[PDB]
Design a protein around this ligand. Structure first.
Ligand SMILES: *[C@H](C)[C@H]1/C(=C/c2[nH]c(/C=C3N=C(/C=C4\NC(=O)C(CC)=C4C)C(C)=C\3CCC(=O)O)c(CCC(=O)O)c2C)NC(=O)[C@@H]1C
Ligand SMILES: *[C@H](C)[C@H]1/C(=C/c2[nH]c(/C=C3N=C(/C=C4\NC(=O)C(CC)=C4C)C(C)=C\3CCC(=O)O)c(CCC(=O)O)c2C)NC(=O)[C@@H]1C
Ligand SMILES: *[C@H](C)[C@H]1/C(=C/c2[nH]c(/C=C3N=C(/C=C4\NC(=O)C(CC)=C4C)C(C)=C\3CCC(=O)O)c(CCC(=O)O)c2C)NC(=O)[C@@H]1C
Ligand SMILES: CCC1=C(C)/C(=C/C2=NC(=C\c3[nH]c(/C=C4\NC(=O)[C@H](C)[C@H]4CC)c(C)c3CCC(=O)O)/C(CCC(=O)O)=C2C)NC1=O
Ligand SMILES: CCC1=C(C)/C(=C/C2=NC(=C\c3[nH]c(/C=C4\NC(=O)[C@H](C)[C@H]4CC)c(C)c3CCC(=O)O)/C(CCC(=O)O)=C2C)NC1=O
Ligand SMILES: CCC1=C(C)/C(=C/C2=NC(=C\c3[nH]c(/C=C4\NC(=O)[C@H](C)[C@H]4CC)c(C)c3CCC(=O)O)/C(CCC(=O)O)=C2C)NC1=O
Ligand SMILES: CCC1=C(C)/C(=C/C2=NC(=C\c3[nH]c(/C=C4\NC(=O)[C@H](C)[C@H]4CC)c(C)c3CCC(=O)O)/C(CCC(=O)O)=C2C)NC1=O
Ligand SMILES: CCC1=C(C)/C(=C/C2=NC(=C\c3[nH]c(/C=C4\NC(=O)[C@H](C)[C@H]4CC)c(C)c3CCC(=O)O)/C(CCC(=O)O)=C2C)NC1=O
Ligand SMILES: CCC1=C(C)/C(=C/C2=NC(=C\c3[nH]c(/C=C4\NC(=O)[C@H](C)[C@H]4CC)c(C)c3CCC(=O)O)/C(CCC(=O)O)=C2C)NC1=O
Ligand SMILES: CCC1=C(C)/C(=C/C2=NC(=C\c3[nH]c(/C=C4\NC(=O)[C@H](C)[C@H]4CC)c(C)c3CCC(=O)O)/C(CCC(=O)O)=C2C)NC1=O
Ligand SMILES: CCC1=C(C)/C(=C/C2=NC(=C\c3[nH]c(/C=C4\NC(=O)[C@H](C)[C@H]4CC)c(C)c3CCC(=O)O)/C(CCC(=O)O)=C2C)NC1=O
Ligand SMILES: CCC1=C(C)/C(=C/C2=NC(=C\c3[nH]c(/C=C4\NC(=O)[C@H](C)[C@H]4CC)c(C)c3CCC(=O)O)/C(CCC(=O)O)=C2C)NC1=O
Lengths: 172, 213, 162, 172, 162, 173, 162, 172
């Protein structure tokens, strides 16, 4: 579990020198964009369950053979696997957005997902489409201004689109 | 003393919730407080032997009379009872003479915690503690772990948590390791060899004379 | 899955002992029960198109708003009503599965595990399928011992919905 | 853990159609042969311990090097392994006879026996021979009529000879 | 209960160490936040009789069958509508509790634990209270940053219903 | 159970089942204003944590010399360490209660069985109270003096700390 | 490492739930604390050569025998005094690390873990570095609230030595 | 005539979908870097006539038969012909940097230019030796900083030189 701060700390520990001035200048900018980071993370967990069901319908339409019999997500028990576990991507993504680093995302939700499926028979490609259907809606939920002050966070939202693309490409 | 080596956890069938509501091929995970009888406690005392040693090593000589008596009395909690079998020198000769340190991590997680190890780097992580704390001290740190005490609870026999399509662990892991087997082939006593006559051949003195013409 | 044959097997496995007369008597209780249960399954498979037509129309007359309210969850559009006969057509399979298997195994493994888990998410009210099964409970037309055997699995599914 | 019934159920679940008429005609025959299944299974467990010792002596004669020193079954602890264990084949075989299916036999007593021996040094072939010495005596115990009504069960006894041959060939 | 003061306490308890600067910075994050949250609670307590009247009438117009269908679960009789204002009157307390406590503690301990457990039994559809809270989300009349903080707890209850 | 000043009012208002009254929100708004003084007092104790354990230990073991004398309950180096280690555990659960502003965390961990556990142990309860009462006049005195800080009178807040040690003392001896 | 951002993360991980408002308020508390802590780190990095010269000479005047006694452990030879400025030069890095990280993480992971373990072996008295840090505590020259934040990590290291 | 703004419309019309949010974040960077280009473009056009003769101080000095009697740049209207349209390269390259996409460049200098240059008899390869000499002088002026606030202009400059390389490829 690493931060943006402890990323710089563990990197400066390996060289064994003091923290340089521009690194403190860069981390002072993260303090200024710190309140926008709580704007984006609070907006996802408020719309957490609404974006799980909405991305599930768009997945199970466009691959109909899954909930069809013989499919990997056919029975009601497995189905509650491939639906409730779509939160677990979002659980570890919004951890990484609030952390600002992809270390927590890597060793919990990324380290064995492409591992565990060969023994399970779950198709890797189907999951990728699913997380990639979360990404265009999770970015779109945090994009629109309604009752918040207007700001610019395109340099910060691209981190969120990178986090889903890190989660997608490591499996499929 | 020193905090443990930091290990990454992999994806594992018990690490998450799974929505199985009681399936049949799942264990009968026993409790001490149900019993109220002579009868129930003989079956419960047998399933904990079946977990920690294994079925094959469940012979009467190994079994401890004092420990069995305690469960009936109820003086000792089943979680305090498993400490008897893990720190039993009848158990210790069977598994600690024959298994390395990293296998000793894996066998204790596989039986007592009833879980597969996550990775390789965490058997390395638990390894330092065992050498310093002893075998008893590593077992003591495993049973007083927060993970063991919350999920098994206080009085429930060890078992495997989630095995939707997973090998039984007794079958999956041998009592002893692949290393100690190779010693048994090395000390097989081959018959009719040149090697056992090598220590006799050097004791015999031979003088050789060569003539050149 | 759960079957009173395999219920006798998995119980004797944990004790590590042979199939005594304790586990053996559980088998013939399953065997002679099948002869009142297999033609209880034949009464449902022959009447397959009747009941899924009957229960679907019984749901609409019980809940008249479910045909009018606009939403994916409801049956306002055609693909809702196409998904209507799929769902109750999926219930009658497992009841015929669990009647033939003789236990609540297929009802456990294929229907009710995570059934209360999905209905919170897709806002499918379980009282919809309660009235759907209660039409099948009254319209099956089975008589005698076989009817009694086919009647419990309908009621076992209802208590799992609630 | 599967039956003959739940074999048909899980097969009919994958196609997603109702149970066909001849499948119910075939399962009605299993009801009629259900009472012959009970007698055969019951007989084995009555002669369980007598057929473990009798197959052990015929094994340890014809391979004398096992209980000879240096052998894999030399010492008593090891010896009480190879002897008691021989019940565990019979424990999972008579489960499969009463189940009428080889699913319980496969994932408990067959899934790692050919696995576990390379790390153990036990000879796989010798174990296979021992189970094949059980098979000709287990069939011969259930074959002979003494104090039972005469019937025909050659189509059912061949399932038992198939179960030991499934248990034998998966190891050696 | 869960409070980011006590979240800092219970975390430092399991490690068995003193309150360092790690747990201490979690306190002033709760402190400053209260000044945008306490008048977020004052906006709800002053408008108490407005919202429970507003959300109850919003439920009936959204679901017109719940006033007509005969059953204890519904609001056909008078004691149903008496139990109507009790339920949404019970929701607004915990939102004002969890705004004042500053965490989702009282929402965890008093509302959503076993909330999906009871609604399967009494066949109370959770989508009833979804539309009830969404009326409060649009008509609480609060403004600014403080209102936004107050709102999350409305949306945190909705995701717990679904 | 772990309670706040806030969840004290919450669980009290839950039992009556009514909304939160206006003066209760007026009182809790005052706790926000004194919230920064609460971090002033809690940070000053844990910085002087190990210095006040050793200093209260010497004043205890002088004035009762029979403890580290042989035959005493704190004689050998093991028991001694346990007693020494423990004196942090009062301070661990006191400064939890100061930052909580409530005595619920202090009660069910460090107070619920201390007067229980000593009859089986043979440790003297009265002596322990003295040890904690020697912490109290030094812990108040550490947070009292102002060096390089704004000066304000929290005397209404420091009396909560003197109440917390007096709650911890009188429940044992 | 320990950071009150990651303290909020690892706490929400074991419960297996999303980042609610309980963990979210722990973030802001770290954020606005940095603005009184980053120029608290700038006061130490600018005065780097002053303090390691000051604390090393303060140790020799406090303990005059440590310059005279013959031994590797002491500072009689030149390589002892070369290892003197290395050690206190290593302390000031972690204090600037733990001020910038905002928690006692780098003090835990890099300094005090096994710090009482090595000093028994190499017979380095911890009271040497107590007086070394106490010179830095009085002569770091920082003022205001930021200075106070820096001071706690100095006092947190002293209690770890004793 | 296409643009950066209009070409990301034109392919988005061909697929018939709404414009995605990461395309708008792409165009937001185009607006962000827009001010620099106007500044960059103005320096080329203000030194437009100074580039052409300074390229003609090497286009003819390196291949000196061209203006010697016999070459196709020999007589005086022939010489004014390769200054009449040496600048038309600069007239349309500056249109390409203004539009930001080379689709207005390829209709005028790249479309039928290689056809006339074998119909007339002029050396086609002797053009692209000197259009490279224009690019060596164009990016020297556009990068040079005098009395201008400094920001990285690496992105704009590299693909300014890509327009000259497209201008040399379709003639040679
Ligand atoms: C989902 C988009 C796809 C899909 C999934 C599906 N998964 C399973 C079963 C399991 N999945 C896991 C996964 C994890 N465990 C972890 O610890 C983590 C990281 C935190 C993950 C991602 C596990 C352990 C299981 C086994 C059962 C369990 O949940 O405990 C199934 C069931 C398959 C079966 O045969 O039983 C399915 C269907 N299915 C799809 O179609 C999607 C493409
Ligand atoms: C010493 C000359 C070199 C060195 C030592 C070093 N090792 C580690 C980490 C570990 N060491 C072990 C070693 C053992 N484990 C065993 O069970 C046994 C037999 C009983 C031995 C010899 C293990 C398992 C580890 C992993 C972590 C652990 O302590 O439990 C470290 C710490 C490194 C780190 O934390 O990353 C060090 C310093 N390393 C050197 O630099 C010397 C060259
Ligand atoms: C010291 C001021 C007094 C004193 C103390 C003393 N304590 C013990 C032994 C134990 N004390 C505890 C205490 C706690 N456990 C907890 O969980 C908490 C709350 C966080 C507390 C306060 C425990 C568990 C033990 C025993 C085992 C262990 O510590 O690990 C002793 C030991 C006595 C003996 O004979 O063993 C002593 C001497 N002694 C005095 O005289 C003082 C008044
Ligand atoms: C953890 C609890 C918490 C939250 C949620 C929080 C949010 C928060 N967002 C703020 C500002 C802001 N937040 C945004 C966010 C955005 N504007 C847009 O148009 C974008 C689409 C979007 C980012 C994607 C902006 C633009 C501001 C302007 C003020 C600033 O820069 O902070 C501020 C400044 C202070 C104030 O508003 O009173 C707060 C409080 N503060 C807290 O303490
Ligand atoms: C094999 C046993 C089995 C059954 C029966 C089953 C049902 C089931 N029906 C669903 C949705 C649905 N179920 C229905 C059915 C109905 N809704 C109505 O309006 C009508 C009242 C009613 C039919 C009479 C509809 C319309 C949907 C789609 C709802 C949505 O997409 O939100 C869903 C969630 C999404 C899906 O994959 O399609 C499941 C899991 N799943 C199973 O594994
Ligand atoms: C439920 C399915 C299942 C089976 C069958 C199984 C077998 C199994 N037999 C073992 C050992 C053994 N297996 C045998 C058996 C034999 N060795 C011989 O010499 C004979 C040739 C042969 C018997 C015919 C013996 C003697 C041991 C003890 C060897 C030792 O301790 O090193 C071991 C390792 C130690 C143990 O726990 O007892 C396993 C895991 N485990 C399983 O989970
Ligand atoms: C679970 C405990 C249990 C057992 C063991 C059991 C066995 C059993 N086998 C029976 C019949 C029978 N069992 C056999 C079996 C055979 N005959 C042969 O010649 C073949 C070699 C062999 C089959 C391979 C036959 C032929 C009958 C005749 C009656 C019938 O069809 O059931 C019957 C009929 C009723 C009776 O005998 O009183 C019983 C009770 N019933 C039980 O409740
Ligand atoms: C403190 C948080 C809290 C809430 C909110 C809560 C609700 C709650 N409402 C209930 C029943 C009820 N809930 C309602 C409410 C409604 N039904 C309708 O028809 C309307 C659509 C809707 C109101 C808008 C009614 C009428 C009953 C009685 C139903 C019955 O008795 O079967 C019940 C079961 C019986 C009871 O004790 O009264 C609970 C537990 N319990 C809690 O502990
Ligand atoms: C000797 C008796 C005495 C005390 C105790 C005292 C404390 C004290 N702390 C203050 C401020 C403060 N104190 C803190 C302390 C902190 N905030 C955090 O979030 C951190 C976790 C923590 C430090 C670790 C802060 C942030 C302020 C803001 C005002 C200031 O800079 O002084 C002030 C400013 C004036 C006022 O509050 O009225 C007082 C009075 N003054 C006194 O006369
Ligand atoms: C990055 C943070 C960091 C620090 C600061 C650190 C200090 C440190 N200093 C050490 C030894 C030492 N430390 C000193 C320093 C001193 N002794 C004196 O006499 C003087 C009073 C004083 C200096 C002012 C000396 C001379 C040794 C060698 C002692 C020996 O070899 O026994 C040792 C043990 C042996 C070693 O590897 O060199 C450590 C671990 N280690 C760390 O990881
Ligand atoms: C608007 C875009 C555009 C361009 C660029 C263009 C070029 C162009 N240059 C031409 C001739 C020419 N082009 C050149 C140019 C050169 N020959 C040389 O010796 C030098 C190497 C080189 C200049 C660097 C010369 C000298 C002629 C006259 C050749 C002749 O008359 O045979 C001709 C044929 C006759 C003409 O009308 O003048 C065309 C069409 N036409 C266009 O419509
Ligand atoms: C259409 C009339 C017009 C022009 C010409 C114009 C140019 C222009 N270039 C600007 C900035 C700038 N222009 C440059 C350009 C460069 N710096 C380098 O070192 C590179 C070599 C070079 C690009 C190749 C830079 C770096 C800035 C910094 C400010 C900014 O990003 O806009 C700005 C910002 C506002 C200002 O300067 O007052 C203006 C006005 N604005 C206009 O309205």
């Amino acid at each position: 579990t690493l931060d943006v701060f402890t990323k710089v700390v563990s990197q400066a520990d390996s060289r064994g020198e003091f923290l340089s001035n521009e690194q403190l200048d860069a981390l002072a900018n993260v303090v200024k964009e710190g309140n926008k980071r709580l704007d984006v993370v609070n907006r996802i967990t408020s719309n957490a369950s609404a974006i799980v069901t909405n991305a599930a319908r768009a997945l199970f339409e466009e691959q109909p053979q899954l909930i069809a019999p013989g499919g990997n997500a056919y029975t009601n028990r497995r189905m509650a696997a491939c639906l409730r576990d779509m939160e677990i991507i979002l659980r570890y993504v919004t951890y990484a957005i609030l952390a600002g680093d992809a270390s927590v995302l890597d060793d919990r939700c990324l380290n064995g997902l492409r591992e565990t499926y060969q023994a399970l028979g779950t198709p890797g490609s189907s999951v990728a489409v699913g997380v990639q259907k979360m990404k265009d809606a999770a970015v779109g939920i945090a994009n629109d201004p309604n009752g918040i002050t207007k700001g610019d966070c395109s340099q910060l939202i691209s981190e969120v689109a990178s986090y889903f693309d890190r989660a997608a490409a490591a499996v499929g | 003393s020193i905090p443990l080596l930091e290990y990454k956890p992999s994806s594992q069938n018990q690490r998450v919730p799974g929505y199985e509501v009681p399936n049949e091929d799942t264990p009968r995970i026993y409790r001490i407080e149900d019993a109220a009888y002579d009868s129930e406690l003989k079956e419960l005392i047998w399933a904990t032997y079946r977990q920690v040693f294994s079925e094959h090593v469940i012979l009467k000589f190994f079994r401890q009379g004092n420990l069995e008596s305690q469960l009936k009395n109820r003086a000792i909690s089943v979680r305090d009872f498993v400490r008897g079998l893990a720190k039993s020198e009848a158990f210790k000769t069977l598994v600690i003479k024959s298994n390395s340190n990293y296998r000793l991590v894996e066998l204790a997680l596989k039986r007592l915690l009833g879980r597969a190890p996550y990775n390789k780097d965490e058997e390395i992580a638990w390894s330092i503690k065992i050498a310093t704390n002893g075998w008893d001290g590593f077992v003591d740190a495993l049973l007083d772990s927060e993970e063991y005490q919350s999920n098994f609870g206080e009085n429930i026999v060890p078992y495997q948590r989630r095995r939707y399509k997973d090998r039984p662990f007794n079958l999956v892991t041998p009592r002893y390791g692949n290393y100690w087997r190779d010693k048994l082939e090395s000390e097989r006593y081959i018959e009719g060899d040149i090697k056992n006559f090598l220590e006799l051949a050097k004791s015999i003195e031979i003088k050789t004379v060569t003539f050149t013409p | 899955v759960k079957t009173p044959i395999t219920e006798a097997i998995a119980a004797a496995d944990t004790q590590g002992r042979f199939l005594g007369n304790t586990e053996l008597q559980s088998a013939r209780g399953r065997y002679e029960r099948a002869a009142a249960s297999l033609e209880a399954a034949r009464g449902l498979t022959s009447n397959a198109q009747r009941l899924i037509d009957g229960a679907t129309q019984a749901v609409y007359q019980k809940f008249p708003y479910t045909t009018q309210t606009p939403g994916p969850q409801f049956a306002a559009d055609s693909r809702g009503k196409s998904k209507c006969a799929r769902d109750v057509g999926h219930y009658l399979r497992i009841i015929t599965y669990s009647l033939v298997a003789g236990g609540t195994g297929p009802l456990d493994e294929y229907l009710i595990a995570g059934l209360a888990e999905i209905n919170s998410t897709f806002d499918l009210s379980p009282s919809w399928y309660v009235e759907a099964l209660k039409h099948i409970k009254a319209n099956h037309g089975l008589s005698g011992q076989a009817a009694n055997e086919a009647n419990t699995y309908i009621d076992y599914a209802i208590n799992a919905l609630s």
